[PDB]
Amino acid sequence: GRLIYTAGGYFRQSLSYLEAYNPSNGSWLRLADLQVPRSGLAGCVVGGLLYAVGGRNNSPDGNTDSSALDCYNPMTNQWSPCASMSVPRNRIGVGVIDGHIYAVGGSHGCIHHSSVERYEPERDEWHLVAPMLTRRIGVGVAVLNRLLYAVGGFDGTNRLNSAECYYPERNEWRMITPMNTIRSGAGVCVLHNCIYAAGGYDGQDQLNSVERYDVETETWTFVAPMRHHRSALGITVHQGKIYVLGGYDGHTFLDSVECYDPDSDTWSEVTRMTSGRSGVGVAVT
Ligand SMILES: CCOc1ccc(S(=O)(=O)Nc2cc(CC(=O)n3cccc3)c(NS(=O)(=O)c3ccc(OCC)cc3)c3ccccc23)cc1
């Protein structure tokens, strides 16, 4: 694609923002608000459309977890409701394989899901697939080699360094090598055939460390840390670089956006969001 979209988020309450960043010229676009505020949601893109999945409305009047799927068309600057999920999923992870959206884990009240469901845009229908081996909220999701990876999270009692791999053709999950660090609320993405896990919360502190998984060596290796510690950060890849957006550093809701260059193994700051926030959904189109 060519813009980095960021939807929703949290600062004092759940937010309705849809904004877009153009890395070519540094401009920020203010686009149509979400119809209902939400934080702890995920963003993805299928066929030029942006989707906002799951999350929760943390408001002064109450907190309501979201089963919603909403569809944003950049050509009309309009959000439309799509079919809701089987269950609300706050602190959800999502990935896309073959034009289908996978909604992974997340929470509904105190229920920590291990369930996974798959959306087909052509039918506007969700179906459950095989559940993960582990309940995971605050989970990161990456898609690599047409496999779906669920990384880290919190199972309701244990904060996780574990990760597992979903095989869509076989409809089954397998545990993979765990991370070096316990991480919930990390940003997880794929860049140049590796799975990156950036930031998160290890049970003691928000993290600035970043590690990556090589699927053939089956090993996780640390790379350069971020400039800021961040949990519930947004993450995406744009032109061979990772972008991380906002998150909570333990004290402030960050407006910082950093960019990771894999060739030089360096982070740098590229822009600031218009306001500090955490728990956003991010995608590129
Ligand atoms: C003063 C901070 O205020 C806020 C309010 C609201 C937010 S949010 O809108 O982004 N939603 C989220 C909250 C939490 C959890 C969280 O931080 N809070 C904060 C208030 C209530 C929950 C998560 N998981 S986590 O990062 O793994 C994590 C981090 C810290 C933890 O313990 C600290 C002792 C436990 C888990 C999340 C993971 C993914 C996506 C969203 C998350 C963020 C911060």
Query: How far apart are the C-alpha atoms of 105 and 150, rounded to whole Å?
Result: 9
112 sits in which H/E element:
strand 111-112
Q: What is the resolution of this structure in A?
A: 1.8
> Which atom of ligand 1 is nearest to 159's Cα?
27
Query: How far apart are the C-alpha atoms of 175 and 25, rounded to whole Å?
Result: 42
Helix %, strand %, coil % for the chain, to 5?
Answer: 0, 55, 45
CA distances from 146 to 99, 167, 170 (A): 11, 8, 12
Which of 41, 107, 248 has most ligand 1 atoms within 8 Å of CB, for mutation? Answer: 248
CA angle 6, 235, 117 (to 5 degrees): 85
Report yes or no: 123 and 101 within 8 Å, Cβ to Cβ: no
Is there an atom of ligand 1 within 6 Å of 4 CB? no
- The number of angstroms, rounded, from the C-alpha of 121 to the middle of its chain's C-alpha atoms is 20
Is there an atom of ligand 1 within 6 Å of 134 CB? no
Closest CA to 194 of 214, 180, 177: 214
Q: What is the CATH number of the domain that holds 70?
A: 2.120.10.80
Cα torsion through 13, 50, 97, 118, rounded to 10:
60
Q: At 8, list the tokens.
A: 């929703």
* Burial bucket for residue 168 (CB in 10 Å: 0-12, 13-18, 19+): middle
Close Cβ partners of 217 (under 8 Å, ≥ 6 residues apart): none
62-65 and 56-59 strand pairing? antiparallel
Is there an atom of ligand 1 within 6 Å of 39 CB? yes
Q: How many CB atoms lie within 10 A of CB 172?
A: 12
Question: Quick one: DSSP state of residue 11?
Answer: E
Instruction: Please count the structural domains in the chain.
Output: 1
Tell me which long-range contacts 172-177 makes (C-beta under 8 A, separation of at least 24).
Answer: 172/130, 173/130, 173/131, 173/132, 173/133, 174/133, 175/133, 176/149, 176/213, 176/218, 177/213, 177/218, 177/219, 177/220
Query: How far apart are the C-alpha atoms of 230 and 278, rounded to whole Å?
Result: 9
Q: How many CB atoms lie within 10 A of CB 206?
A: 20
Is there an atom of ligand 1 within 6 Å of 40 CB? yes
Report yes or no: 98 and 76 within 8 Å, Cβ to Cβ: no
- 122 CA distance to ligand 1 centroid (A)? 34
- The number of angstroms, rounded, from the C-alpha of 10 to the middle of its chain's C-alpha atoms is 14
Query: How far apart are the C-alpha atoms of 143 and 83, rounded to whole Å?
Result: 23
Report yes or no: 228 and 254 within 8 Å, Cβ to Cβ: yes
- The number of angstroms, rounded, from the C-alpha of 46 to the middle of its chain's C-alpha atoms is 15
- 65 CA distance to ligand 1 centroid (A)? 14
* Domain range for 47: 4-284
> Which atom of ligand 1 is nearest to 39's Cα?
9
* Burial bucket for residue 127 (CB in 10 Å: 0-12, 13-18, 19+): exposed
Report yes or no: 229 and 251 within 8 Å, Cβ to Cβ: no
CA distances from 248 to 72, 82, 208, 232, 234 (A): 26, 30, 11, 7, 11
